[PDB]
Enzyme design. Structure first.
Site, mmCIF file in Angstrom:
data_model
loop_
_atom_site.group_PDB
_atom_site.id
_atom_site.type_symbol
_atom_site.label_atom_id
_atom_site.label_comp_id
_atom_site.label_asym_id
_atom_site.label_seq_id
_atom_site.Cartn_x
_atom_site.Cartn_y
_atom_site.Cartn_z
ATOM 1 N N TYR A 8 6.516 -10.085 -0.247
ATOM 2 C CA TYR A 8 6.278 -9.202 0.901
ATOM 3 C C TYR A 8 7.072 -7.892 0.859
ATOM 4 O O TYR A 8 6.858 -7.021 1.687
ATOM 5 C CB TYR A 8 6.616 -9.939 2.228
ATOM 6 C CG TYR A 8 8.032 -10.452 2.275
ATOM 7 C CD1 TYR A 8 9.066 -9.599 2.626
ATOM 8 C CD2 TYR A 8 8.338 -11.729 1.963
ATOM 9 C CE1 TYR A 8 10.366 -10.007 2.631
ATOM 10 C CE2 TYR A 8 9.641 -12.160 1.959
ATOM 11 C CZ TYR A 8 10.662 -11.307 2.300
ATOM 12 O OH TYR A 8 11.994 -11.713 2.353
ATOM 13 N N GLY A 9 7.984 -7.781 -0.101
ATOM 14 C CA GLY A 9 8.886 -6.665 -0.111
ATOM 15 C C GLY A 9 8.946 -5.971 -1.459
ATOM 16 O O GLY A 9 7.946 -5.494 -1.982
ATOM 17 N N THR A 10 10.159 -5.917 -2.002
ATOM 18 C CA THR A 10 10.416 -5.235 -3.250
ATOM 19 C C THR A 10 9.781 -5.825 -4.473
ATOM 20 O O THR A 10 9.774 -5.188 -5.535
ATOM 21 C CB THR A 10 11.930 -5.092 -3.551
ATOM 22 O OG1 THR A 10 12.478 -6.346 -3.937
ATOM 23 C CG2 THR A 10 12.689 -4.531 -2.351
ATOM 24 N N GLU A 197 -10.526 2.560 13.246
ATOM 25 C CA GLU A 197 -10.490 1.188 12.719
ATOM 26 C C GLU A 197 -9.841 0.199 13.648
ATOM 27 O O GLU A 197 -9.688 -0.981 13.314
ATOM 28 C CB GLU A 197 -9.774 1.163 11.342
ATOM 29 C CG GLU A 197 -10.404 2.116 10.366
ATOM 30 C CD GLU A 197 -11.693 1.749 9.870
ATOM 31 O OE1 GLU A 197 -12.242 0.681 10.217
ATOM 32 O OE2 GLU A 197 -12.071 2.449 8.863
#
Length: 269
Positions: A8-10, A197
């Site tokens: 979810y991150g780096t 959207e």
């Protein structure tokens, strides 16, 4: 004894630590788990009052990779979570460290907005391939620098948003192939797209894809994907005509014909 791994991150594609995953296969580019995302690096927190999601990607990680991650991420622990994907629910590992909440639950979306990324490469696969609504809203001036036809491997254009008058378009990460138009837009065009959207009402979410346009590869292109997907039904006529005009202008004849036949084959709501 490979393990599914939700990042979810780096560790996400095109982020600074992604090389740690080496050649781990990406099983799902589009994935989520119930929880909250914080900027601390990024971390996740789980509690029984979570009513939103953390967005990320699923990889198949070998033992070596998991050891490497264990060693790199000092002070992080891991557990498994149930991950929702376009093709079912999966169990995957996730790293966490026990900061400020990221409302979107999406680190890449956060990077885009918080760093005012400019330009944005915006991939449209439905009625945003046509210009009439842009013109009515006074924003068409932002949508006059198309990179052009772009191919997206791994997704099919499908009509999964249910509305009273028929469906709206989506892309499902189901192993198909699809086409759309890639636009180069200023950052200042983004909030128009977020409104169109229905981002704030959880209609679509911002999402990211890598596409091929003009023999060139474009990374982390913005698109929008349906949040509550339903079985496909036919789009209403007015909307279908927008798609058809945009596909006729930009896309391959073979793809446009397929897309038309698909839309016309669907049952009515």
């Amino acid at each position: 004894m490979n393990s599914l791994l939700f990042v979810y991150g780096t560790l996400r594609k095109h982020e600074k630590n992604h090389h740690l995953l080496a050649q781990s296969a990406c099983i799902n580019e589009q994935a989520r788990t119930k929880g909250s995302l914080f900027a601390a690096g990024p971390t996740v927190v789980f509690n029984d009052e979570d009513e939103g999601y953390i967005y990320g990607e699923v990889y198949e990680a070998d033992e070596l990779c998991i050891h490497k991650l264990d060693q790199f991420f000092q002070g992080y622990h891991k557990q498994t979570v149930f991950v929702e994907t376009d093709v079912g629910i999966k169990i995957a590992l996730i790293y966490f460290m026990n900061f400020t909440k990221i409302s979107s639950g999406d680190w890449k979306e956060h990077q885009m907005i918080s760093k005012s990324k400019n330009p944005i490469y915006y991939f449209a696969y439905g009625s945003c391939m046509d210009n009439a609504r842009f013109q009515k809203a006074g924003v068409d001036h932002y949508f006059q620098d198309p990179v052009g036809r772009a191919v997206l491997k791994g997704y099919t254009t499908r009509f999964t948003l249910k509305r009273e008058d028929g469906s709206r378009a989506d892309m499902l990460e189901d192993g198909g192939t699809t086409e759309g138009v890639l636009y180069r837009i200023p950052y200042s065009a983004l909030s128009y797209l977020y409104k169109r959207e229905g981002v704030e009402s959880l209609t679509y979410r911002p999402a990211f894809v890598d596409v091929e346009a003009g023999g060139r590869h474009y990374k982390d292109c913005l698109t929008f994907l349906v949040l509550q997907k339903e079985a496909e039904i036919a789009p209403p006529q007015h909307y279908q005509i927008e798609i058809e005009r945009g596909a006729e202008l930009y896309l391959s004849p073979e793809f446009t014909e397929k897309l038309k036949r698909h839309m016309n084959s669907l049952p009515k709501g």
